[PDB]
Design a protein around this ligand. Structure first.
Ligand SMILES: OC[C@H]1O[C@H](O[C@H]2[C@H](O)[C@@H](O)[C@@H](O)O[C@@H]2CO)[C@H](O)[C@@H](O)[C@@H]1O
Ligand SMILES: OC[C@H]1O[C@H](O[C@H]2[C@H](O)[C@@H](O)[C@@H](O)O[C@@H]2CO)[C@H](O)[C@@H](O)[C@@H]1O
Ligand SMILES: OC[C@H]1O[C@H](O[C@H]2[C@H](O)[C@@H](O)[C@H](O)O[C@@H]2CO)[C@H](O)[C@@H](O)[C@@H]1O
Ligand SMILES: OC[C@H]1O[C@H](O)[C@H](O)[C@@H](O)[C@@H]1O
Ligand SMILES: [Ca+2]
Length: 516
């Protein structure tokens, strides 16, 4: 893996459940059997959306966790684990959606202003999820929902391996900047979503709080605003993305804009921990979307990310570490293109996000963006997952592998692996002062024969004069590898004489000894 390390020893594979309720897809007995089968193929738990629109439909405080409970009951019967997603967002309207579950219709009546929803540069209204600006309503509603959920699901704490939160549209921490009705669907640039009267005044107050007065504002932005009402979000999103973002005003606007999402992260993170920490004691996480298009568009750089709310990922991730939430990213199955008109750079994006996450010590979990239909995409996922320290991978979605035995068999082999620590020992290595020994192998878990970025470092044992190291490997899988020497300057000097192998790696920790 990266930095001479191996795959993450805590890696686990997860299966994303269907969007529709199980009873609308099959019966509970078949479902329980599907889970036993999934478990046989390396899946540790099934992640599932529990829609707010279902749990509090009737009215405020009128809960119904009957479905969630029945679902957990079957997971328990199958001897599996589940990862509930407290989806406070709407189901339907997004890519891949095949459901229709809006958030409780009554929530919109708790306000007379327009503080609850989103309005784009061109007036398009969006009600897929509560606007994070309304922290007062979110604190109340999410606070109540989470605590009610904890009580109702207390009896099943033993099958709950983790809890996910929905930070926005599609259960992702972001603004709804890419939608069909707003004319911002892939691969178009996104449209900023801060045009409600509430958003405008909030930005105005934030600017005034930062600088004190209009004069200080005009002084900082080098502008000539006539009055406080002139403090506004971009009038022209396109022009802003072309070069307005480079000005002092742009920096402040984007800081505030992304700031709303960071503050929201800290809020839900706190409500969640307060409601689940003592009861379940399981990790909590949220999702960041993979807005990979328009990444390298020369005219409007990061034209889709910025409107989504992603301007500074480093700063964004700090909010997660601060809130004590694990992070989930996507697009692990895709590769870079970066050509007109999409200017798509998913892999580059995933690599950057992963590098940042690992630096800050944030637990990283990945997902695939679109359904996978060929073994080749599983390989791409494997490369990213096992070389960028992912602690987990969640496959979307259920039916894709449940009704396709050959695809399932390929996932079991490449991704449904159980990591096991093994000691590799290489003897008689002709190393000279300054050289370092590494091992690289055929599977992604071994860097796929890469000696530049993904090789696994070994350590000299001065006592037995050989090189060794405890390496994490995929249990019960066949592997081939070779040790090689890296000069002090970083070039590959020589390779092990014979290619080694372990057919397969045993599930018990032992050691593999070979000679150079
Ligand atoms: O609130 C100040 C001003 O902001 C916007 O104008 C920005 C523009 O969006 C940027 O791309 C760049 O040109 O800097 C401008 C400020 O000097 C709003 O469009 C404008 O209405 C508002 O008054
Ligand atoms: O690069 C893929 C390739 O890597 C290894 O081949 C090594 C070989 O082991 C060394 O002795 C020397 O020849 O450099 C080669 C790399 O060019 C694997 O052994 C091989 O299976 C794999 O395809
Ligand atoms: O079931 C989980 C969520 O699935 C969809 O959202 C996915 C989307 O399909 C995928 O392309 C993207 O990369 O990630 C999101 C979030 O996992 C539904 O649209 C969501 O409502 C579900 O919560
Ligand atoms: O915008 C939703 C979807 O748009 C496109 O299909 C992208 O390829 C995909 O990665 C993304 O999830
Ligand atoms: Ca409530």
């Amino acid at each position: 893996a990266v930095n001479g390390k191996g795959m993450n020893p805590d890696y686990k594979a997860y299966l994303m459940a269907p969007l529709k309720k199980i009873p609308e897809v099959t019966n509970w007995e078949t479902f329980e059997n599907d889970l036993r089968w999934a478990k046989q193929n390396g899946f540790y738990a099934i992640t599932v959306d529990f829609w707010w629109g279902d749990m509090e439909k009737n009215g405020d405080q009128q809960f119904d966790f009957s479905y969630a409970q029945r679902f957990a009951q079957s997971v328990k019967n199958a001897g599996m684990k589940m990862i509930p997603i407290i989806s406070t967002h709407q189901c339907g309207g997004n890519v891949g959606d095949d459901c229709n579950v809006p958030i409780p219709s009554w929530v919109w009546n708790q306000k007379s202003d327009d503080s609850l929803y989103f309005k784009s540069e061109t007036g398009t209204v969006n009600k897929e999820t509560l606007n994070p600006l309304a922290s007062d309503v979110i604190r109340k509603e999410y606070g109540e929902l989470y605590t009610a959920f904890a009580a109702a699901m207390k009896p099943y704490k033993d099958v709950i391996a983790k809890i996910f939160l929905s930070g926005g549209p599609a259960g992702e921490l972001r603004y709804p900047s890419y939608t069909t009705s707003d004319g911002t669907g892939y691969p178009s640039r996104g449209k900023f979503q801060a045009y409600t009267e509430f958003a405008k005044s909030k930005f105005r107050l934030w600017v005034l709080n930062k600088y004190g007065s209009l004069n200080e504002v005009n002084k900082a932005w080098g502008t000539k605003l006539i009055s406080e009402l002139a403090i506004l979000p971009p009038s022209d999103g396109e022009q802003f993305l072309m070069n307005g973002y480079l000005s002092m005003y742009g920096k402040d606007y984007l800081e505030w804009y992304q700031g709303i999402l960071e503050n929201h992260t800290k809020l839900i993170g706190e409500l969640a921990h307060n409601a689940f920490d003592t009861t379940f004691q399981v990790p909590i996480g949220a999702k960041i979307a993979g807005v990979h298009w328009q990444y390298n568009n020369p005219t409007i750089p990061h034209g889709a990310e910025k409107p989504a709310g992603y301007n500074d990922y480093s700063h964004l991730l700090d909010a997660f570490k601060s809130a004590k939430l694990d992070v989930t990213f996507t697009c692990l199955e895709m590769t870079d293109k970066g050509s007109y008109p999409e200017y798509s750079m998913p892999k580059t994006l995933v690599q950057n996000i992963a590098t940042l996450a690992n630096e800050k010590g944030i637990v990283l979990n990945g997902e695939n963006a679109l359904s996978i239909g060929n073994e080749e995409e599983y390989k791409r996922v494997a490369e990213m997952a096992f070389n960028y320290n992912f602690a987990g991978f969640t496959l979307l979605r259920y039916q894709d592998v449940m009704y396709n035995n050959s695809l399932m068999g390929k996932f079991k082999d490449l991704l449904g692996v159980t990591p096991v620590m093994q000691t590799i020992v290489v003897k008689n290595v002709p190393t000279t002062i300054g050289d370092t020994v590494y091992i690289t192998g055929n599977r992604a878990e071994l860097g796929s024969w890469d000696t530049k970025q993904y090789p696994i470092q070994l350590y000299y044992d001065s006592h037995s004069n050989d090189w060794r190291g405890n390496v994490v490997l995929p249990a019960e899988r066949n592997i081939e590898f070779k040790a090689f020497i890296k000069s002090k300057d970083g070039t590959v000097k020589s390779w092990q004489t014979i290619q080694q192998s372990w057919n397969p790696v045993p599930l018990k920790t032992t050691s593999h000894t070979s000679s150079w």
